[PDB]
Symmetry: C3
Subunit: 300 residues, 3 copies
């Protein structure tokens, strides 16, 4: 058992659009009218090259900038590099990815693999302050050959005082069944530091969020401090050793928690019930609505 | 010939009370009228189960919630899971703990071993904001079989702008003899980020705070940023390579340090001498009083 | 490409002269020669086992001290009022830092070595916590090397001190110059009141002691972005432009208002012919010019 990532090395291509959303927001999407905050999950295998055919449907300039992946200066996505996109414009951005390996100097070159993210560098200031606040950001995952694959992947972005730009106390909530292998990508943006905490679960503070084995000294944690543009990820086995229930995740800064940065990891018994939980309730005047569906990785 | 932790797997039982302390404060204790801030140190061996017979001695509801350990949702310690405790009420809380090992899918399940903590989730808000502010928090240590055991353990909690809820510039101070193996558990709570620093000593930033050997890449540090609910720990040999002295520890955020988050690790020669220490001095109007005794782990 | 240069065994007794002096604008700094003080102060590099005697002289009209992180020192070298190790105006003192290799103790435990990215700063100016001294610029990098550690071509020091980089005016950089392929070391230190996040475009490093993965078994997260707070220090090395190419590669704090307010600089990575595609040097940004690139630091001789 346990599905693992294959070798990379393929040239891949997708479309991405930036568009205005309700109420002053902006998002990236895989099709016109389909933009979401966070933008679509992009998933690659080390060695893969990705050509993103990008179109800006808005009436202001926008760009696409990425952390951690290889790109040439012309793909930086900045005014400074003349890599932004005019209103109505199209540009092809290119991201590349490489495996680890020995350098001739004897050192070991780290590969591209990790939890990363992309966002706008252009809207509102030349640092993307406006774009990021408006919602233009998304997750990118690069797998090393042999990395364990999860059943589903959820993305949690602490953006200023919001989770995924949602109104306070709206979650989101994510559904799983006890035993599911579930991946979280955790990204932070804006002005503030936070601490991400998840009830009833824990992970390894390292590249994959999972210990490699008995020799891995990495601290096991349930709580992690994070600043703007930090990203990390991990996988848990839902309800492992703790059983079903509505398991809270939240920022652990006390006022942030009280002010609505909280959501539920809803872990169901095999029969679909969660012990001791009331679904349609309001919390501080707001309802979390339906659980957010897991993100499907983009294109190909 | 360093002492090491034995294998776990027992069933342990303790009693725990919540009671009001002076000045709007609240604490946990092992006996009525014995509550302390921070609460008693609880120490377990990976695999141990702990039943806590909990009694709420106060006139308002309270709860007990734990990080990192295994527990069922009915032990969550929250209003939402109906696991809180009414005034004058009793409940048994159960915490469980497991060793690392291979799963059936071939992956490696991380153990519970680590530096963790427990606090109230119900007082002042359903996030425990009031309980934590008031002092209901305390350390939990889970040892992996073969972990090095210290001579003594001290707990340092940065709760908002205070150390262990003490008035500004009161320490606490901790006392050791040169060569003692001393363990510190460092927990943060409240609204603020901090950076913990200890003069004259250093530790590995990894699960146990010690390097496993020559193959551990973990950064050796004397300074660590930490946010609300962050938990870590480490051991030092007191005065190693440095000698006796009053060795300051403190938040390194400059104003926090000036405003009183500072204490002393007082390391003595066998004949008692402590260079760089004036025992009768007040600092910014306050005195640290006598050194805090090392916490002895709650007996079963 | 030959095998990288690596640090030898330490164990030598070394000695330098160090001064504190006032600089323009109410600032203060450490220097290797009178009139030569810099912010940050001179880079100090040792090999594990080295002892360093710092013959220190305060040229200022107010007291000052020298305190260090991570390195072995006796209480009389603490550099604090409490330990009576501060220096009076015109005063001199010998500060001694020692350093040790890793190894097994008698108890069978492994003692961690001194090696790492560390720093020194005043502990007595403005308050007994060195709050004024640090604000004014009395701080600098210390590197301790384990035998075998890879040595870079050049080292640069980036200090986020409150809202400034190296106490420079907003939007002035500094910028650092390299050529594609150069092995470039960064020492990154934070001071003052604020948390930040350090980010470098186009490059990445391992979050661990050396900033470099030890091999295929090292689990450390590979990152381009790192949260840091007052007195934090870490370091890494990158191969400039590796897999990416020439360009003006931005580094900045990633807290949005901080980058907007000027904590930004350029890692200027030139092609072998000395040119940078699509970049211009004399621009002003938000009213300020970054001036010429910061020359790399020669470790104190
Ligand atoms: Cu940027
Ligand atoms: Cu928060
Ligand atoms: Cu919790
Ligand atoms: Cu970014
Ligand atoms: Cu409603
Ligand atoms: Cu909680
Ligand atoms: Cu603090
Ligand atoms: Cu220090
Ligand atoms: Cu908590
Ligand atoms: Cu008094
Ligand atoms: Cu200090
Ligand atoms: Cu900043
Ligand atoms: Cu970037
Ligand atoms: Cu310091
Ligand atoms: Cu000018
Ligand atoms: Zn709530
Ligand atoms: Zn003080
Ligand atoms: Zn700018």
């Amino acid at each position: 058992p346990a599905k693992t990532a294959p070798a990379g090395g393929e040239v891949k291509r997708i479309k991405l659009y930036a568009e205005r959303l309700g109420g002053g927001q902006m998002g990236y999407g895989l099709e016109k009218g389909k933009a979401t905050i966070p933008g679509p999950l992009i998933e690659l295998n080390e060695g893969d090259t990705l050509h993103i055919e990008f179109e800006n449907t808005m009436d202001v300039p926008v760009s696409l900038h990425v952390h951690g992946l290889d790109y040439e200066i012309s793909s930086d996505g900045t005014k400074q590099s003349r890599s932004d996109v005019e209103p109505g414009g199209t540009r092809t951005y290119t991201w590349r990815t490489h495996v680890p390996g020995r350098r001739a100097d004897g050192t070991w070159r780290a590969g591209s693999a990790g939890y990363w993210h992309y966002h706008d560098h252009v809207v509102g200031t030349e640092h993307g302050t406006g774009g990021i606040r408006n919602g233009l950001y998304g997750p990118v995952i690069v797998r090393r050959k042999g990395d364990v694959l999860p059943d589903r992947t959820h993305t949690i972005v602490f953006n200023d005082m919001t989770i995924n730009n949602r109104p306070a106390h709206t979650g989101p909530d994510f559904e799983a069944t006890v035993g599911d292998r579930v991946e979280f990508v955790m990204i932070t943006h804006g002005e503030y530091y936070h601490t991400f905490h998840l009830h009833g679960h824990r992970w390894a503070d390292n590249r994959t969020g999972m210990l490699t084995g008995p020799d891995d000294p990495s601290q096991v944690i349930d709580n992690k401090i994070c600043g703007p543009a930090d990203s990390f990820g991990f996988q848990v086995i839902a309800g492992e050793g703790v059983g079903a229930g509505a398991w809270m995740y939240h920022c652990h800064v006390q006022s942030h928690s009280d002010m609505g940065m909280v959501g539920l990891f809803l872990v169901k018994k095999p029969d679909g019930t969660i012990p001791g939980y009331d679904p349609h309730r309001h919390h501080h005047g707001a309802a979390s609505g339906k659980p957010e569906k897991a993100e499907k990785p983009a294109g190909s």
